[PDB]
Amino acid sequence: MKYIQTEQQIEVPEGVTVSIKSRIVKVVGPRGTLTKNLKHIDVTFTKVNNQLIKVAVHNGGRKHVAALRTVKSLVDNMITGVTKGYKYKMRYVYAHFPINVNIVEKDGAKFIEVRNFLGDKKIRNVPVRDGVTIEFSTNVKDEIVLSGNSVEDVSQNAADLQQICRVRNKDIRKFLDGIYVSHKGFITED
Amino acid sequence: SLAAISRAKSLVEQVARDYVRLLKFGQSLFQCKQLKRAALGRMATIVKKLRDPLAYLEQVRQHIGRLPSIDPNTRTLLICGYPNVGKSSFLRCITKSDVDVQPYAFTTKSLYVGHFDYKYLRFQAIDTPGILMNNIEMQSIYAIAHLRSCVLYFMDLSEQCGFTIEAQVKLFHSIKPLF
Amino acid sequence: PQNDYIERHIKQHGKRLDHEERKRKREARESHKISERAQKLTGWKGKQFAKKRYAEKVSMRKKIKAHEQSKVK
Amino acid sequence: RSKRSKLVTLAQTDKKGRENKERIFDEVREALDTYRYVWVLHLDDVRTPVLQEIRTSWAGSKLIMGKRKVLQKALGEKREEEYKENLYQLSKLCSGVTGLLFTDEDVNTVKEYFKSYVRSDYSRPNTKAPLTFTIPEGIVYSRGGQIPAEEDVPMIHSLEPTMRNKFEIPTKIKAGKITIDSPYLVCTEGEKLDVRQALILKQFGIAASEFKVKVSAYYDNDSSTVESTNIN
RNA sequence: AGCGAAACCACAGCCAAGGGACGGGCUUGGCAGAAUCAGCGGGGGCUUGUGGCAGUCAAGCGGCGACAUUGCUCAUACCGAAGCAGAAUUCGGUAAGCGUCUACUGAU
RNA sequence: AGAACUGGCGAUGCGGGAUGAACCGAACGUAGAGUUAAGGUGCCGGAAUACACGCUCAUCAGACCAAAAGGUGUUAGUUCAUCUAGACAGCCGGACGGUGGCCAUGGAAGUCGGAAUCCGCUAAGGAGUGUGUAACAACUCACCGGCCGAAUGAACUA
């Protein structure tokens, strides 16, 4: 029907503040700050009463309208991250070979090192993105916790850790060594 | 299934001989083309109607290869008695082997082998699926008869399953002539 | 590997830590990949896919029709 | 195109449609002229075998067959729609589960039955557990140790993913038995039960919650009183 | 050193495609050294993978009828699935890799 | 293919068809002036990168019959179902009694198997759609109910 105008609403909690111009979105709050670029999505922002931000598209087609809702989700994720924060828990279980996960600072990159994965001599290094912080879980068996403000950085790092621990052409049922995302909770849950 | 496979192969050979001779004497593209489809047409029909036996073969293939490699010729130790009255856990104790210990009547449905060495000579203990006939029980009957072994009979007196020894003794006499 | 060397591993070990997640995600993605396959897979691949896909829908429709008679009766 | 592909599994049952509501709509109106007293129940949570016991405990008393919002229309939400005098005020006092009792029994009988009646139930969501329980710090069993662990049966491996993922507890499988490294506190008194907390108790079968139908308003076909001897 | 022919000669004689049947002259694009010269000798909007005959039924098309239907007649490498425990292996896809006068070139 | 009839060529220049038998218009003395046929108006190429309404992302698009059907591609419609008694979807609850229905049998308690698929109350519930166990157990849908708040769902045509 080629909607003349489609609008979406984003609730802004009082604890955070957002500044909007040409589509580089910045979010500021107690936990820090986040930045996102939306110049490729061609949406229009508008501050209503400092508590609700309106995103609208004029003459948006079905393909364009579908992209409108994504802006709210990405903006909402940034707002939640600065307020609640995202914590991705993972457990590096193993059958026989103990999986050793450590952090090295070669060139100051704080690379994550995985050793003795299924007895492999090769040492696997996983880079750590900006913003995400690694903290080994205490008194929890073989649990590693990833925390950060940006969902993309925290989530992507968790995916990389699990992906690089792939078993090379072996029976998946019989081989269980690897890293999996046990939980996707928040930092300051309530 | 095996006989049908051989018959299908023979029919396929007949297909080649019949149509190839006809095709090699053709004089038009359509005749050769149409006859070519006829040659391969029967092969599809023969195989298409062979679906039922083929499925059975695959199921047997994926299970027959998984069967334990028990050796009737070498020394073996058969285990028999009332269903899973302590016998199932016995095999794991003798040597490195795994058997379900959860004590329900027929804890084992098929044979097991556990290898151990004594006097520098190899031995392999065998566990029966269980004896109360049932087709599953029939596997043990032939194992007892056609395996060179000294079978061990299992019973309980004070702790396990509290079953009456009278039934076990009476059931023992049923197998007495055979083994 | 006696006989049940992997079915005894589905239990007593679990398939993985998060196994259903991979299977569940793949099943959902199949609906999207089916559309991609139809437009792609030129040549004999498309012809085989089109013929096989048509039979699946025809067979599926027949199953629904048969059930309706049984359900009503 | 590009729409959600609806999925359905073939089953004997089928939707009732609006025609079922029409029979429901007329049922309430008929009851107003057949029975003497009218009551509205607020049983926000129910158990079908328990409901049958309450329903089968008597024959004259009848639980009205209908839907909450349909009951309002059937009873009449306005003076111009009420089937009987003063009924419209009564209808707008009940909401939620379709709780409503039509009977000829005396008011004293109604209050006595509900007040004395009480039954056990699972700890439903939005409630607070009246007790506390900690799972054993080792291998877990079906009942979680509330009954002697020696008599309890080990938890089946098939339910491990539910505990690990749905309940979020850090469970793991050890030789076919679920194990935990600490005595996880499932719940405690004063906490409002979340769905995960209620499910954990529901899975263990801990029916540590009482259930009784609460009734607020009373009405009659000739007295037309709107008295409410509410009991909670 | 000095002497001194013959055969042949409409004209020129670079490529991909279109030129209906003849491309060597036409057309679309790209080419070409002015000039000279020695060798290796080089020449001299078809198609595939699934049968003939006979018969039931039908999604539909408007009396016809798709598929189902009954009788006989790679060795290499990287990914996804396989009771793939290991080794070895098949299947599907990807790389089609990998195997049982003038062309060229010396020289000015 | 073949019998016959009527037209173009066969003796034929001109413009367009990027070139082209038989395609489109146009049947020719040598000249100047103006309007046109078919073709075109981004450059080669003389003429508007004119206007109006829609339509398409194609990983050689589009301008050049093997196509019946497939595609969670796009756009406008046709026939039906529900709807402020609350349409769709998302969560939560109920999801029952005979009954562990009858038979094979170590076991099929709805969910390895064979014929019925009966019944009472219900708010709606299939001797049960799947997951699931050695058999139980447990989860789920189909079926209703509670919180949400209006259009939604099914098959076809172009």
Side-chain angles (χ1 to χ4, degrees):
Chain A
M1 56 187 276
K2 203 170 190 178
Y3 301 91
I4 185 157
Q5 178 170 293
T6 58
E7 301 169 47
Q8 264 290 354
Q9 305 189 145
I10 316 179
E11 293 82 356
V12 178
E14 307 192 353
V16 288
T17 62
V18 298
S19 153
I20 291 98
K21 204 159 167 180
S22 86
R23 285 94 73 210
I24 310 298
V25 177
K26 181 173 187 169
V27 182
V28 177
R31 201 170 303 288
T33 63
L34 289 172
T35 47
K36 190 152 280 294
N37 188 350
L38 300 175
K39 278 188 171 171
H40 58 72
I41 207 154
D42 303 332
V43 294
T44 287
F45 283 72
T46 296
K47 172 250 284 176
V48 176
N49 60 354
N50 269 318
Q51 286 75 247
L52 189 143
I53 311 303
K54 271 190 174 196
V55 285
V57 179
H58 311 106
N59 314 72
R62 193 189 304 287
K63 285 288 194 75
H64 199 175
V65 169
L68 184 272
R69 174 64 101 82
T70 70
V71 175
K72 168 173 183 292
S73 314
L74 297 189
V75 174
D76 194 352
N77 286 358
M78 284 195 288
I79 284 161
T80 52
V82 183
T83 57
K84 293 187 173 180
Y86 295 84
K87 187 205 297 189
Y88 268 39
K89 313 189 205 165
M90 326 176 73
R91 201 187 304 283
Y92 43 92
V93 302
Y94 60 90
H96 168 237
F97 294 102
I99 289 164
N100 207 328
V101 194
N102 298 278
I103 298 163
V104 298
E105 309 95 328
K106 68 188 191 170
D107 311 339
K110 291 176 177 179
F111 264 82
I112 295 160
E113 294 227 312
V114 167
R115 290 165 175 271
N116 203 69
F117 167 71
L118 189 43
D120 288 356
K121 291 252 69 175
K122 186 188 180 179
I123 304 105
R124 296 163 190 285
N125 303 138
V126 183
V128 181
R129 290 172 154 276
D130 296 346
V132 55
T133 54
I134 294 90
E135 58 210 302
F136 292 118
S137 206
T138 300
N139 83 49
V140 194
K141 295 183 183 292
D142 307 312
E143 180 176 78
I144 181 166
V145 170
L146 303 169
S147 56
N149 301 341
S150 166
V151 177
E152 275 56 62
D153 298 306
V154 172
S155 179
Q156 187 62 68
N157 211 152
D160 290 0
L161 280 155
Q162 172 162 1
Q163 180 160 1
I164 61 109
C165 292
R166 188 192 311 287
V167 196
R168 161 168 150 74
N169 310 2
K170 297 275 102 166
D171 205 285
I172 299 110
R173 292 160 285 204
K174 200 89 183 190
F175 290 84
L176 313 165
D177 302 348
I179 315 182
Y180 317 85
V181 177
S182 52
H183 196 232
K184 304 174 186 171
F186 300 88
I187 299 170
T188 53
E189 195 169 287
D190 191 10
Chain B
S1 305
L2 301 188
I5 290 280
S6 176
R7 188 173 180 80
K9 197 184 79 170
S10 304
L11 294 168
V12 167
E13 291 160 28
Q14 189 93 346
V15 176
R17 284 189 274 89
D18 290 343
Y19 288 93
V20 170
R21 197 174 77 78
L22 293 161
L23 195 132
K24 63 172 69 172
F25 297 125
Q27 309 299 341
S28 77
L29 181 137
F30 178 68
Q31 188 191 19
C32 296
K33 176 169 168 172
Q34 209 288 317
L35 200 133
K36 183 265 291 194
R37 305 192 84 247
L40 312 191
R42 199 188 305 168
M43 302 192 184
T45 301
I46 293 155
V47 174
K48 271 194 290 186
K49 294 198 177 190
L50 202 67
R51 64 189 85 162
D52 291 351
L54 280 159
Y56 173 77
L57 282 158
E58 183 70 354
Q59 286 195 343
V60 175
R61 209 279 303 172
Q62 294 182 12
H63 188 203
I64 193 167
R66 291 191 282 116
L67 293 169
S69 65
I70 79 92
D71 189 16
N73 307 280
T74 51
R75 288 72 45 189
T76 81
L77 286 175
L78 270 283
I79 302 159
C80 284
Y82 205 64
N84 190 25
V85 176
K87 59 106 173 185
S88 188
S89 187
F90 194 67
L91 197 145
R92 100 188 297 111
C93 306
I94 270 165
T95 185
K96 180 176 168 76
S97 308
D98 184 36
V99 193
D100 193 352
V101 178
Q102 180 52 228
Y104 64 97
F106 268 63
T107 307
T108 48
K109 289 195 198 82
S110 158
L111 298 167
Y112 291 72
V113 290
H115 284 208
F116 73 101
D117 297 358
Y118 189 57
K119 299 198 194 190
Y120 311 116
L121 190 123
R122 176 59 60 81
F123 295 89
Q124 64 211 288
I126 291 162
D127 171 33
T128 184
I131 286 155
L132 285 169
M133 303 185 175
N134 303 352
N135 184 52
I136 294 156
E137 177 173 320
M138 182 56 66
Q139 300 173 105
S140 73
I141 296 168
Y142 270 76
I144 294 153
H146 294 113
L147 297 176
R148 179 256 294 240
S149 190
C150 50
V151 62
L152 274 51
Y153 223 102
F154 259 87
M155 283 101 155
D156 171 81
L157 174 56
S158 180
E159 283 109 47
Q160 280 167 60
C161 202
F163 217 88
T164 51
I165 291 162
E166 289 84 342
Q168 293 166 345
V169 167
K170 280 180 281 184
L171 263 296
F172 183 95
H173 299 312
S174 73
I175 318 306
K176 168 163 166 284
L178 180 273
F179 80 144
Chain C
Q2 206 81 242
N3 38 23
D4 48 13
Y5 50 90
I6 38 171
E7 70 171 11
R8 264 173 42 259
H9 262 273
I10 290 163
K11 51 174 156 183
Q12 311 271 335
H13 277 286
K15 300 178 189 176
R16 303 289 292 290
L17 208 165
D18 286 345
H19 173 274
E20 305 198 334
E21 281 72 20
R22 296 293 109 179
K23 173 169 279 189
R24 204 271 299 155
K25 267 180 170 264
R26 193 181 298 185
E27 288 174 338
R29 288 207 307 273
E30 279 276 31
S31 67
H32 288 71
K33 207 166 189 176
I34 283 156
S35 171
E36 181 171 334
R37 279 200 199 84
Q39 293 161 76
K40 298 191 83 71
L41 306 175
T42 48
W44 259 123
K45 307 173 190 169
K47 295 178 72 151
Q48 291 293 331
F49 188 90
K51 293 172 78 174
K52 284 173 159 67
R53 188 72 177 165
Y54 182 53
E56 292 158 30
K57 276 193 169 182
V58 170
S59 58
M60 184 268 290
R61 283 161 186 164
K62 287 190 179 183
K63 287 170 160 61
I64 289 162
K65 181 58 60 54
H67 159 79
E68 286 290 304
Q69 295 187 353
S70 79
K71 173 164 71 185
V72 175
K73 298 183 179 183
Chain D
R1 276 180 248 204
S2 190
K3 54 165 189 165
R4 182 183 174 168
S5 54
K6 285 285 281 179
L7 294 168
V8 69
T9 178
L10 309 176
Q12 296 293 103
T13 55
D14 193 9
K15 298 207 185 289
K16 315 306 183 181
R18 194 191 183 76
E19 288 297 314
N20 164 272
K21 300 178 199 179
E22 271 285 6
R23 185 178 64 74
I24 269 78
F25 184 87
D26 212 29
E27 193 85 327
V28 176
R29 296 159 95 260
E30 285 197 350
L32 285 159
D33 62 70
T34 304
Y35 288 103
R36 285 276 296 176
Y37 313 95
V38 187
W39 292 78
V40 305
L41 278 50
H42 289 79
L43 71 183
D44 283 319
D45 212 89
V46 294
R47 182 75 155 96
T48 303
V50 172
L51 296 204
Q52 290 201 66
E53 182 264 308
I54 286 167
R55 175 56 260 289
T56 203
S57 61
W58 37 45
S61 278
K62 167 64 76 164
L63 279 163
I64 209 69
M65 154 168 290
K67 182 185 206 288
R68 186 259 159 174
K69 286 195 176 188
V70 176
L71 292 172
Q72 300 288 299
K73 211 182 203 296
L75 296 167
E77 310 188 75
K78 310 192 196 89
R79 179 183 60 178
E80 292 79 31
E81 299 173 19
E82 62 180 359
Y83 192 87
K84 285 213 74 54
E85 308 101 275
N86 306 109
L87 186 64
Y88 78 100
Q89 300 284 24
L90 185 88
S91 76
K92 298 189 287 186
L93 307 173
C94 54
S95 69
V97 168
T98 76
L100 207 154
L101 164 59
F102 265 89
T103 191
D104 284 348
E105 302 302 323
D106 191 37
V107 65
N108 299 290
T109 315
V110 175
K111 60 102 187 173
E112 193 71 8
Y113 176 93
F114 293 137
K115 282 178 177 189
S116 64
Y117 187 89
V118 69
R119 276 284 296 177
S120 65
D121 197 0
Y122 304 124
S123 69
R124 288 287 206 287
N126 201 49
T127 70
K128 61 187 184 184
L131 81 183
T132 187
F133 156 64
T134 48
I135 303 168
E137 74 285 346
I139 287 161
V140 303
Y141 292 75
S142 75
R143 186 44 171 279
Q146 298 296 74
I147 65 187
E150 301 95 325
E151 308 178 39
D152 208 0
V153 182
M155 290 206 134
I156 310 107
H157 56 267
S158 190
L159 72 100
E160 202 277 347
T162 303
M163 284 261 176
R164 196 192 60 255
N165 289 21
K166 183 61 63 164
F167 303 165
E168 212 260 306
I169 62 174
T171 42
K172 70 177 283 181
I173 190 168
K174 272 192 178 191
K177 296 179 280 186
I178 295 91
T179 308
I180 58 186
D181 65 340
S182 58
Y184 184 84
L185 172 58
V186 303
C187 199
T188 181
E189 300 96 331
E191 167 58 296
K192 201 133 280 170
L193 266 76
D194 197 73
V195 69
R196 66 179 290 285
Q197 287 154 352
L199 282 157
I200 290 158
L201 291 160
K202 199 194 297 189
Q203 194 69 15
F204 279 109
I206 292 158
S209 189
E210 66 92 28
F211 158 69
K212 62 191 190 300
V213 62
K214 53 177 280 185
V215 51
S216 68
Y218 157 69
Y219 174 85
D220 193 74
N221 293 309
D222 52 62
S223 186
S224 320
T225 189
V226 201
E227 188 269 320
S228 176
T229 174
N230 174 228
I231 72 194
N232 299 306

